[PDB]
Design a protein around this ligand. Structure first.
Ligand SMILES: [Ca+2]
Ligand SMILES: [Ca+2]
Ligand SMILES: [Cl-]
Ligand SMILES: [Cl-]
Ligand SMILES: [Cl-]
Ligand SMILES: [Cl-]
Length: 148
C-alpha cells in the first residue's frame, strides 16, 4: 500500500517576494481509519536550516482517499532568500481524539531532489507563472531526517 500522491502548484513573484502554494488534490492515499478510509488535511510549512518558520493548513475532507482542496496559501520570501528555503507539504489523517498521524510528506526547495527539485527549479525559472506538479508522498521519518 503506497502512501499516495499530492498535486500542488508553486508560483514565485521575485519583485514582491511572494511565494504561493495551491494545494489541488491528493490521490491513492493510504487508509488510516480502521474499517474506513481517511479524513485527510494538508499542512504547509516554510522551513530553513531545520526551523519551522511558518505553518498553514487546509480544511479537512471526510471519508476519502482522493481529496480535492483547491486551497491557496502565500508566504513572504524575499528574492535574496528564496533559494535558501524549503516548502514542506504533509498529508495527515484527522482524528477528533488523538494526534493526527501523517500519511506522508514531501518538500521542495533547498536540498530537494528528483521531481521535487524539478518542480522548484521550474518555479524559479518562470517568475509569476504558476506551475502544477504531482509528487509521491514519502514516509515522515525520512523526510524529517532530510529537513532536521
Ligand atoms: Ca485514524
Ligand atoms: Ca481519521
Ligand atoms: Cl475543516
Ligand atoms: Cl495522541
Ligand atoms: Cl495536527
Ligand atoms: Cl505532474
Amino acid at each position: 500500500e503506497k502512501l499516495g500522491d499530492i498535486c500542488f502548484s508553486l508560483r514565485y513573484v521575485p519583485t514582491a517576494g511572494k511565494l504561493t502554494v495551491v494545494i489541488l488534490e491528493a490521490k491513492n492515499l493510504k487508509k488510516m481509519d480502521v474499517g474506513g478510509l481517511s479524513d485527510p488535511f494538508v499542512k504547509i510549512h516554510l522551513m530553513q536550516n531545520g526551523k519551522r518558520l511558518k505553518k498553514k493548513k487546509t480544511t479537512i475532507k471526510k471519508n476519502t482517499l482522493n481529496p480535492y482542496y483547491n486551497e491557496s496559501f502565500s508566504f513572504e520570501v524575499p528574492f535574496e532568500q528564496i533559494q535558501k528555503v524549503q516548502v514542506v507539504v504533509t498529508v495527515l489523517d484527522y482524528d477528533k481524539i488523538g494526534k493526527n498521524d501523517a500519511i506522508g510528506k514531501v518538500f521542495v526547495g533547498y536540498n530537494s531532489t528528483g521531481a521535487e527539485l524539478r518542480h522548484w527549479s521550474d518555479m524559479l525559472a518562470n517568475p509569476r507563472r504558476p506551475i502544477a506538479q504531482w509528487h509521491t508522498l514519502q514516509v515522515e521519518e525520512e523526510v524529517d531526517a532530510m529537513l532536521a
